[PDB]
Amino acid sequence: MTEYKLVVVGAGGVGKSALTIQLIQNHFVDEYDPTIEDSYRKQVVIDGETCLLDILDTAGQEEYSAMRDQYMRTGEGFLCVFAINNTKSFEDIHHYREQIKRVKDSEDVPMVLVGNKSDLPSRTVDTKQAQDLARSYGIPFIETSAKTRQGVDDAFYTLVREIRKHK
Ligand SMILES: Nc1nc2c(ncn2[C@@H]2O[C@H](COP(=O)(O)OP(=O)(O)O)[C@@H](O)[C@H]2O)c(=O)[nH]1
Ligand SMILES: *S(=O)(=O)c1cccc(S(=O)(=O)Nc2ccccc2)c1
Ligand SMILES: [Mg+2]
């Protein structure tokens, strides 16, 4: 069946592991070693079609590793994640997006900007700010909460649909 290679990038602490574990396993994890990089798998149905998702959840110390580069080159779509309560993580988005364009040597790369931790009231990044950034990159912006599951499926399936159309 059709397989999709997705990569979740963003500053440490933004919820990459929580988002991926929520999608794959339907559990919210509040204590996941931030140094663990791992690939996750799940069969899902998207628009009536069964497909296999392969998802790389990234750890900071592997950023410039050869193995990370292999996964990035073969990756087909990228979630760029920040937390809506952490301005620094939002400021960092350009760094992750720049690395993707470099490794793929392309402007036409499926990506979604993800604003996570939407269930937290102490917001510091406005949705309008993130939509403007998303617009400037030509990508969708999806609000998520790994805790409540808000937008989790939407974020990953939107990326899959982007890849599906890109193919
Ligand atoms: N309230 C809330 N906490 C979250 C959310 N996503 C992640 N977290 C928490 O943020 C911390 C870091 O998340 P983690 O998945 O380890 O981030 P990573 O470093 O990007 O993998 C953990 O304490 C998680 O419980 C969310 O959507 N809502
Ligand atoms: S890894 O051990 O090279 C690995 C584990 C599971 C799946 C894959 S993959 O062939 O599907 N490549 C990939 C690339 C980007 C994001 C996820 C998976 C590789
Ligand atoms: Mg993690």
XYZ file of C-alpha atoms and ligand atoms in Angstrom:
215
model
C 0.000 0.000 0.000
C 1.021 3.625 -0.463
C 3.675 4.663 2.069
C 4.548 8.177 3.198
C 7.795 9.312 4.837
C 7.142 12.176 7.256
C 9.627 14.081 9.436
C 8.756 16.158 12.513
C 11.218 18.985 13.193
C 11.335 21.890 15.617
C 13.000 23.108 18.748
C 13.360 20.777 21.669
C 10.329 20.949 23.951
C 7.711 21.951 21.413
C 5.899 18.600 21.496
C 7.266 16.635 18.539
C 7.391 13.386 20.460
C 4.031 14.043 22.123
C 2.448 14.784 18.745
C 3.914 11.696 17.089
C 3.063 9.379 19.963
C -0.440 10.848 20.063
C -0.932 10.145 16.356
C 0.626 6.686 16.379
C -0.609 5.427 19.717
C -3.511 7.685 20.789
C -1.770 8.427 24.109
C -0.483 11.747 25.444
C 3.011 11.275 26.896
C 4.291 13.970 29.252
C 7.677 12.314 29.942
C 9.526 11.328 26.767
C 13.333 11.536 26.755
C 14.107 14.565 24.584
C 17.319 12.939 23.335
C 15.506 9.992 21.696
C 15.235 10.093 17.910
C 12.981 7.384 16.539
C 10.900 6.296 13.562
C 7.235 5.460 14.088
C 4.735 3.579 11.946
C 0.971 3.320 11.631
C -1.550 2.184 9.051
C -4.255 4.829 8.634
C -7.113 5.591 6.258
C -6.925 9.007 4.588
C -9.757 9.935 2.221
C -10.849 6.319 2.019
C -7.399 4.982 1.123
C -5.345 2.850 3.494
C -1.777 4.032 3.725
C 1.332 3.464 5.797
C 2.840 6.437 7.630
C 6.523 6.335 8.556
C 7.314 9.214 10.898
C 10.692 10.403 12.172
C 10.512 12.187 15.535
C 13.721 14.143 15.899
C 16.189 14.771 18.736
C 18.369 17.878 18.856
C 21.733 16.168 19.075
C 21.171 14.373 15.728
C 20.465 17.545 13.749
C 23.658 17.419 11.660
C 24.243 13.662 11.782
C 24.765 11.635 8.637
C 21.851 9.371 9.521
C 19.569 12.361 10.033
C 20.640 13.612 6.613
C 19.688 10.255 5.087
C 16.222 10.445 6.608
C 15.840 14.090 5.557
C 16.822 13.388 1.936
C 14.372 10.487 1.711
C 11.713 12.273 3.756
C 8.733 13.366 1.680
C 6.983 15.822 3.997
C 7.898 17.850 7.046
C 6.037 19.163 10.055
C 7.726 22.287 11.359
C 6.548 22.540 14.963
C 6.657 25.359 17.483
C 4.757 25.816 20.737
C 2.238 28.661 20.951
C 3.516 29.473 24.467
C 7.197 29.665 23.458
C 8.270 32.555 21.258
C 11.804 31.215 20.871
C 10.462 28.028 19.288
C 8.505 30.147 16.814
C 11.554 32.284 16.093
C 13.463 29.070 15.301
C 11.059 27.939 12.575
C 13.038 29.559 9.776
C 16.105 27.543 10.760
C 14.288 24.238 10.370
C 12.614 25.302 7.141
C 15.937 26.453 5.711
C 17.528 23.088 6.525
C 14.724 21.246 4.704
C 15.074 23.317 1.537
C 18.831 22.737 1.639
C 18.698 18.966 2.132
C 15.993 18.556 -0.527
C 17.501 21.178 -2.887
C 13.989 22.280 -3.739
C 11.466 25.016 -3.083
C 8.604 22.575 -3.750
C 8.689 20.519 -0.547
C 5.514 19.384 1.260
C 5.451 21.033 4.664
C 3.032 22.202 7.348
C 3.629 24.762 10.062
C 2.308 23.409 13.355
C 1.491 25.524 16.370
C 1.345 23.060 19.234
C 0.247 23.279 22.892
C -2.936 25.091 21.835
C -4.660 23.966 25.026
C -2.339 26.156 27.129
C -3.701 29.632 27.944
C -0.334 31.430 28.389
C 0.001 32.153 24.679
C 2.873 34.214 23.352
C 2.562 33.640 19.564
C -0.532 34.883 17.758
C -2.300 32.745 15.191
C -2.144 35.732 12.831
C 1.656 35.765 13.231
C 1.860 32.062 12.378
C -0.518 32.326 9.418
C 1.560 35.194 8.020
C 4.691 33.076 8.399
C 2.947 30.099 6.819
C 1.747 32.289 3.954
C 5.279 33.555 3.348
C 6.468 29.943 3.095
C 3.545 28.843 0.920
C 2.403 26.200 3.405
C -0.613 25.569 5.630
C -0.722 26.417 9.317
C -2.405 23.946 11.652
C -3.042 24.468 15.354
C -2.538 21.364 17.464
C -2.662 20.019 20.978
C -0.962 16.703 21.609
C -2.790 16.662 24.965
C -6.368 17.067 23.728
C -5.728 15.657 20.199
C -6.917 18.956 18.677
C -5.673 19.153 15.118
C -3.244 16.247 15.479
C -4.796 14.154 12.720
C -5.359 17.272 10.612
C -1.664 18.211 10.826
C -0.330 14.839 9.679
C -3.079 14.081 7.155
C -2.760 17.569 5.657
C 0.918 16.829 5.139
C 0.100 13.439 3.594
C -2.365 15.087 1.209
C 0.318 17.594 0.202
C 2.706 14.725 -0.555
C -0.058 12.807 -2.350
C -0.680 15.765 -4.652
C 3.042 16.495 -5.018
C 3.403 12.946 -6.342
N -0.045 21.050 27.534
C 0.610 20.484 26.502
N 1.834 19.989 26.729
C 2.488 19.425 25.705
C 1.904 19.349 24.371
N 2.804 18.733 23.599
C 3.873 18.432 24.355
N 3.681 18.870 25.609
C 4.598 18.756 26.724
O 5.808 19.479 26.413
C 6.960 18.769 26.943
C 7.880 18.458 25.786
O 7.191 17.660 24.834
P 8.030 16.658 23.917
O 7.086 15.838 23.115
O 9.090 15.976 24.772
O 8.758 17.731 22.931
P 9.947 17.427 21.870
O 11.221 17.819 22.588
O 9.587 18.352 20.725
O 9.865 15.974 21.515
C 6.394 17.550 27.655
O 6.331 17.847 29.047
C 5.005 17.318 27.081
O 4.044 16.797 27.954
C 0.565 19.904 24.203
O -0.018 19.906 23.105
N -0.004 20.438 25.303
S 15.698 3.869 9.664
O 16.076 2.739 10.517
O 16.479 4.170 8.455
C 13.953 3.748 9.230
C 13.021 3.215 10.096
C 11.693 3.146 9.706
C 11.310 3.624 8.463
C 12.257 4.155 7.611
S 11.812 4.786 5.972
O 12.279 3.870 4.937
O 10.365 4.765 5.816
N 12.542 6.339 5.792
C 11.998 7.516 6.432
C 12.404 8.763 6.006
C 11.873 9.899 6.605
C 10.962 9.778 7.637
C 10.568 8.529 8.063
C 11.077 7.398 7.460
C 13.578 4.214 7.988
Mg 11.182 14.358 21.598
